[PDB]
Structure formats: structure tokens, C-alpha cells
Symmetry: D2
Subunit: 267 residues, 4 copies
């Protein structure tokens, strides 16, 4: 019976909240490892949660986030509610659900030369700051557009409020199963985002006489994409497991995060 606890910076292991967790779980005959098992419990922002998710997937166990700083979308609770939260952690009475996760393959000469995964996005980007990356995007084995661009995002419904949003994308609800493709600064008439069923294959071909390009998954894991490769992104067989509490529904997290005007609501 153990748990992994993840927290933001190095000094962050001693704060009130961390301390409270370490005390309460010890006292209940649960061992506890501290970084930065049956669960990964994490204290911090969305960026820190992504990390924790990264370790929860290796082990194939649920993640559960508790927010510390400025609010985000991924936490199931805030630091004020830690007692209530730890009560569900010791009891193990929380719902667990699979969340759509992306698989990415880098293919050169028909051969898989690398791979990755993302719960948030796969971000394909220009290598050298001079110029544009030429790309062909393909959706279900058929080409949709070729253009030069800063890149292309392939995002989950969960990643839709992040980099994908900045790049011009729509907002997708997190219980949706779909894949979202957002051209990042496409030099073209048509550079609109596209949304596909979760069964589809998105492939992106990188110009063969251009420079190497890069891909960042969940803003943290980096693969080099060689000139002339094909990136294939599909829904991964294996999902990340999310601990779910009785928390604010996404609409409220959206309104809160962007300070959305909601006055006049009757209901």
C-alpha cells in the first residue's frame, strides 16, 4: 500500500499542503515517495500535473491533481480542500476513468524511427527560426492541404484550452472523444482547425528538402523529426487513468479561467 506524491520545485516539498499529505498518509499505514503504487497524487499547476501523468502512465495507475498556484483545468480540487481530498485518497472511493491519449509515430523510409504519446497535444514545429516548414496534412489516408507554416498541433479535447487555443482553435469539452488538428500560422487561405472522430489517423508529411523539424508532446518530451518523415498520430490503445472527484464541471473551469462574462443567466 503506497502512493507517489509530486510537487512543483525543490523547496516545494516542505509547504503546508505537502506536509499535511505526508503526515496524514503515514499515520494511515500508506508509504509515500516524494518527487520533483495505487495512485499518483500531485500538488501544483497543469504543467506539474502533466509530469505526474507521465509517471502514472508508466505504472498504469490513476493520477489525481490538487491545484496550488493560479487555477487551471486539470486539478480535481484546490489546496483548501486537501482534508476532504485525502479522505477519498485513504478510502480509495473515487471514480476512475480512461481519458483519450494520443499515440505518435515518426516514420522514415516506411520505418518507425521514433514514437511518443500525449494527453494534451503533439506539437510539430519549425526547426530553424528562419523561414517556414512545408507540410502536407493527411486525414484518413487522403491529403487535406499542403502549406508552409510554423507548425501543426494535433490535440486532444483536453489539450484544446492550451497551445491549441493560442493558435486559434475551438474549445472542446473534455468528455468528448475526438481529435483536433490546428495549423500553427499556416501561410494559406485555408488554415482552419479540423476535428475528426477518435478513430481517424492524422498524418503529417514534412518537406524532404527542408530542414529537420521538432515535436513536443505535452510541452515536455522532444523528438527530432527528420526532413522527409511522416508523423502519424492516432488514438493510443492505452489511456491515462484520471481520478475523478465531485469537482467543478468544465464549463465552470472555462468561465473562471478566462473570466468569461456570464451575467443575466436564468437557468
Amino acid at each position: 500500500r503506497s502512493v507517489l506524491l509530486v510537487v512543483h520545485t525543490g523547496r516545494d516539498e516542505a509547504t503546508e499542503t505537502a506536509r499535511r499529505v505526508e503526515k496524514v498518509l503515514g499515520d494511515n499505514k500508506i508509504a509515500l515517495r516524494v518527487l520533483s503504487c495505487e495512485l499518483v497524487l500531485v500538488l501544483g499547476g497543469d504543467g506539474t500535473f502533466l509530469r505526474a501523468a507521465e509517471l502514472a502512465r508508466n505504472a498504469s495507475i490513476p493520477v489525481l491533481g490538487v491545484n496550488l498556484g493560479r487555477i487551471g483545468f486539470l486539478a480535481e480540487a484546490e489546496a483548501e480542500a486537501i482534508d476532504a481530498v485525502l479522505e477519498h485518497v485513504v478510502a480509495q472511493d473515487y471514480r476512475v476513468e480512461d481519458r483519450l491519449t494520443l499515440d505518435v509515430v515518426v516514420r522514415q523510409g516506411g520505418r518507425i524511427v521514433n514514437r511518443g504519446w500525449a494527453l494534451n497535444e503533439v506539437s510539430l514545429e519549425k526547426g530553424p527560426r528562419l523561414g517556414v516548414l512545408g507540410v502536407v496534412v493527411e486525414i484518413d489516408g487522403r491529403p487535406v492541404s499542403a502549406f508552409g507554416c510554423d507548425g501543426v498541433l494535433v490535440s486532444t479535447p483536453t489539450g484544446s484550452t492550451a497551445y491549441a487555443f493560442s493558435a486559434g482553435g475551438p474549445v472542446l469539452w473534455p468528455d468528448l472523444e475526438a481529435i483536433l488538428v490546428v495549423p500553427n500560422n499556416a501561410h494559406a487561405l485555408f488554415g482552419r482547425p479540423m476535428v475528426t472522430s477518435p478513430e481517424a489517423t492524422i498524418a503529417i508529411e514534412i518537406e524532404a528538402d527542408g530542414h529537420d523539424a521538432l515535436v513536443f508532446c505535452d510541452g515536455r518530451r522532444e523528438m527530432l523529426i527528420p526532413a522527409g518523415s511522416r508523423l502519424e498520430v492516432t488514438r493510443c490503445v492505452t489511456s491515462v487513468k484520471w481520478a475523478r472527484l465531485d469537482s467543478a464541471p468544465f464549463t465552470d473551469r472555462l468561465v473562471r479561467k478566462f473570466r468569461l462574462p456570464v451575467t443575466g443567466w436564468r437557468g
Copy 2:
């Protein structure tokens, strides 16, 4: 058996394609009714066959769903998204109609209710979009958009579109929507010229409920479903859009995938594709 044939106009009943349909099916002793884009007109038919553009197709789909039978469309002039073939392959199409051996799938449809003082005062459906639009040409309609029981934004606007994946290519696109594959089951919301910082398209699971509140103080507003069925929305009322339990039955042929339809309609640049 019988087949209901839908054509665009009365003087389209005499087109070469339309003439072929009448000959072929007549030769196979399949009774044909013809009509120009009768709520019960396809009662007894095994299929609604349509020749024409996407707008004609939408009329045929209504009649097909009234009867609970498949709709199949062949396009004529204007290139579109919903037809399974072009006029030149009418013989091949007629072969599949006579043998009755095409696939039939469900296509998602939207339920729309108008609610005043807690009760349902009108109801409609859509395969393409529900478009809530301002009454007067003058001002702005104040709305609150509410997603799953919870308010997401309030703003003045020309209106709000609630669209299927199929409708995303239509009026939703014009208003700034993303392109959705007709393969997907989701609901798309597109604020129409919202005077607001946040007027972004939103996409929801197909089990979602989208509600829009119309300002109590202002003018009545209008709803257009699939560009033709109109309801009046009283000020202070509220529109509720969900997935309808009754889908349209969509005949399928071995036809071009949606990706090809998109590239063709918009002339999308595609050179250098398989190159890697």
C-alpha cells in the same frame, strides 16, 4: 415496389438524368412518385432518391425521415457534400437502387425545443444546423449560452448556430467554424458575429445539452432548421438543443471520402502529398 424521387424544380422533372431514372425504374416495375423541392409523400417507398444540390438533398432527407426510410442523393450541377454520386454515374447508381444492395448508416440529428415559462411551446429537428437569428434587422440579440446546465458566455450577437458535424461545412463555416468530419459524433456551437472578446466555436460531446437564453427585455428572435423550417422565439424564452433519438437513414455507395469532398469543393492545395 416504390421510390420517391426529389428534384430541385418542376422544370427539372424533365432533365436527362431525371428521364433515365424514370425509364430504368419503370422497366423494373418500380412505382415512382416525383416531386420538386406531402409530408407523407414517401409513405410506402423503400428509398428517397434525390437529384440536385445539398439544399434539395435536405428537403428529401426530411421526407425520408418522415417515412423512416433511407435517402440517397446524386448531384447535378453545383458540387456539394451530401450526394453519393455525380450525374454521369446515374446508371451505376440505378443498378444499386434496383438490387437494393447499398449500405445504410445512421446520421446524427438534433432535437430542438422552445421553452417558455418552463414549458415546451415549439419543437424542431435538424440534420445540418439549428440557427438562432435576431428578429429585427436593426440591433443585437442578447443571449446567454449554457452548456451542460451551466452558463458559458453572455453577449449581444446576430445569433448562434448549433450544428452537426455534417452542417460544419455549411453556414457554420461561413460564421467561422472548424471543419468537422461527418464521421464524428459531436455538437458544434458557433456564435454568429458576437460582439465579445470570446466568441470562439465550441465543440461538445453528442450527449451534451446546449441551451440558449434570449434576453427578456428585447425583441422576439427566429430559428431556422436546415435552412427552411422556421420557428419564432419569444423574448425571454429558451432554446434547448440535444441529439434526437431518431437518426436519418443515410444510404452509402462506394463514394469519395469526406477529405476528397473538402479538397474538391474548396480547391485545396494538395501538391507533393505522398512525397513524405
Copy 3:
């Protein structure tokens, strides 16, 4: 003195601010006419003074330009862009009205002509926008937009806006326009829900001519100027928008710069500014 006062509604003639204006100017033996938002109503006046929102202001500016005199606006409830002060500083404002010592600048105005078969059949002007809008609620209006004698795009749409820098904050913004500083002299074109890959806003020099052609085969269309002056646009006709040689005379006070007006109206996040 004389001054013409414009208020929003008849039962706004009795507001505390409106009452103050009548007292102050009456005490200085300045004749006051009052009216609610008379094409010649400000004939003889040295100023049109307005109390209310941006819409009320636009009515006053019309009357001021009819008389060739300055307009000055004070806002009441709703925060806007065109007033030079808020209600709470009415005494300070009245001081500048009595001494007649405010600056007056030219604000750019648009000339709009409706042309059929090579001749002018109607004419209008605008300080905010010209909005060409589809007649029927149903379909799409086909247009060709032509910039300086040359076609730039043809598409179906709900309409096309031709806006001043001042109007860019208004209906043009809702339709997806960029924000222009009222300092600039330019013309902005914003396609309204264009069903097209390219429906981007375009910005032109103030010496440009923007013409829009309305499809010959389709329905008549409508033009709204500054949200109130309506003309009917016959199918096959053509709208020509240029800068009018007659500007509006814009009284200025020591007021907030446009940047502050924008931040305030849209609640724009601004924290950490001078930090470098």
C-alpha cells in the same frame, strides 16, 4: 446663442444630467432645444450636445453634420467610445460649452452611392459603417468586391461592411475585424460571414474606392448606414464607397485616449505594464 441637446428617450429629458444642462445654459442665456434620438433642428446652433450612448451620439452627429457644427457627447449609463466625458463631470463639461473653448477636429466620413445601369439611384454617408446585408433571411447574397477598379473576391455571404477607423469597434468587430485607432485615416472592409476560404478583413488608404457588385440573378439587398439610414439595393446594382469631402466636426476635451477606452470597454488585462 443656441445649443441643440440630444437625449436618448423622451423620458430622458428629465434626468439629473439633462436637468443640469438646462439650468447652466439657461443661466448663461443660451437658448436650448431638446430632442430625443427635424433634419434642420441644429440650424443656428453653435454646438450639438449629446447625452447617452454611442447610438444616441450617432443620431446627434447626423444633425450636427446637417448644420455644419460640432458634436460633443457625454455618456450616461453604458460605457462607449464616442463621448468625451462621463455624467459625473457634467459641470466641467458645461464650463467648456459656455466658454466655447474646446478643440474641434475633422472626423472622416464615408460617401456611399447606389448605381444601377450606370447611374446614381441613391446616396448616403456614414461616420461608423456602411453595412450591405442580404434581403431575405433565407439564402446568401452573391457579391463581387472590387477595390481600386479591380476585382478582389467573389463569394456568397450575409453581407459586407465598409467601416471607418471609428466604426471598427462596432459591428465590424463583431464580424471579425481588426481594431483601428480613431486617429487613423483608412477604410476597412469586413466580409460578413463569407462562405469562402478568403474572407479576411482588408484595409485600404482613405483615397481608395471600394465597390461591391450584387448578383444580377438574386434578391434585392439592404444598406444600413451607421445603424439607421436604410436604402434598398436592387439586384444587379453596385455600391460605391469612398471618403466624403465633408467631415463631421468632432469637439474634443482633455479626455481619455482611445487605448484606455478599449481596455475599459473590453476589460483588457493590463497588469505588469510599466515593468519593462
Copy 4:
């Protein structure tokens, strides 16, 4: 009596068009220098023209472009028309006009630590590929928005069809005098482009505890922007001089470049 001739790559000095120029001008007692005076004549695309413009400004003399490859916006003619073009070059009968050019100042501690200029754009961009650049944009001595972003473009009406276009900007006619500001992937509700009179000052403040950022002018000249600096962009006193021929007006160059649908035009 001399002219500078600029051409794309190294092998490019021997092509039919270059050769024709070198012959015709020699024969007319005009000396000619060849790279990559009364005029800078340039053969190539928009990218090569930008370079030539860079050398025409040092000398304070007109540039005149003749297009070789795929069409752009800056050339006054194409390679088929070189004889006609050279006839105006020998005669010196062409119109010359000043085009709006941007001045940029990098200011740290109230002190000018660098500077640049642009006929196309000033592109302020994220330094390290991880994360976002925090920025405050100010327009006439007053703050308009703070956000994180990939960057901010400050563009001329001429640069509006380029990187600024890819980033979501409107199209501006080249005889307009204005300045265009386009937030590049702003994580904010308001990230719309803004257009100012040519008299205005655009300033951009970079977060003081972030990373250093970069600026690229006309896609070629690079300055490092230190954390906590202020970029100031104004209209430069000194303009680039453009040789003007009897060429396609910009509307036609737009339609041609993006293959814009124009059928049905009556006129």
C-alpha cells in the same frame, strides 16, 4: 554612372536574364557590380529583393525588382519583360516613391542598447522553444494588453501579406500609411490585430523574469532582446525608395498570388 545588380544564389550570375542585363548596360556606358550607384536592380523573389532593399537603403538610392521564380508582391516586372525594364533603367525615366519603413529601438534601463529597421516586419519571438513569452503591448504611451504568446509582429502595410498574414492579420494595401500589430499565438481572449496611424509608437515590454527573446527584421537581421527590455517601433524618418513601373496594381497581385475567385465581375 553605375548600377548594382543582385541575384539569388551563386550559380545564378550566369542565367539568361542576368547575362542580358550585364550586356545591355555595359554597351550603354553604365558600370555594373554583381552580388550574391544610381539604382539597385534585383533579379529573384521577394526574399532576394529584401536583401537588395537592405543595400539600397545604406546608399539612399531606389531599388527595382524583377521577378524570376514563383510570383510575389515586390517586383515591378517579370523576366519576360526585361528589355522593356532595361529601357527604363538606361533612360532613368521611372517614378520613385518613398515607402513607409519602420524604426526599432531596443531599450534597457532607459538606455538604447540596439536598433534596427524593417520595410516588411519586425518579428518579436520567443527565445527558448519551451513555453511562452510574457509581453505587455503599448500603443500611444498606454498599455493595451499583457499576455503570453509566441510573439508579436509589427508590420508595414507591405509586410501584411507575409508572416503577418500567416499569424492571422488583415490584408493592407501598399499605398496605405499605417502600422499593423499582430499578436502571434496569444494565449488570451483578445489577441486581435490592431492598426494605428503611422505617427504612433508601438512599444512592447518583455517580462523581466523570463528568458531573453529575439527579433527578426525582414526575416534576415537578428537582435537579441534581453529579459525586461522594451522594444519601441516607430515610423523611421528615412524611407526606402522604390522604383515604380507601369505594373499590375496590388489587387491583381493579391488575386494572382492566392488564386482568389473573381468570376462574375462586371466592372
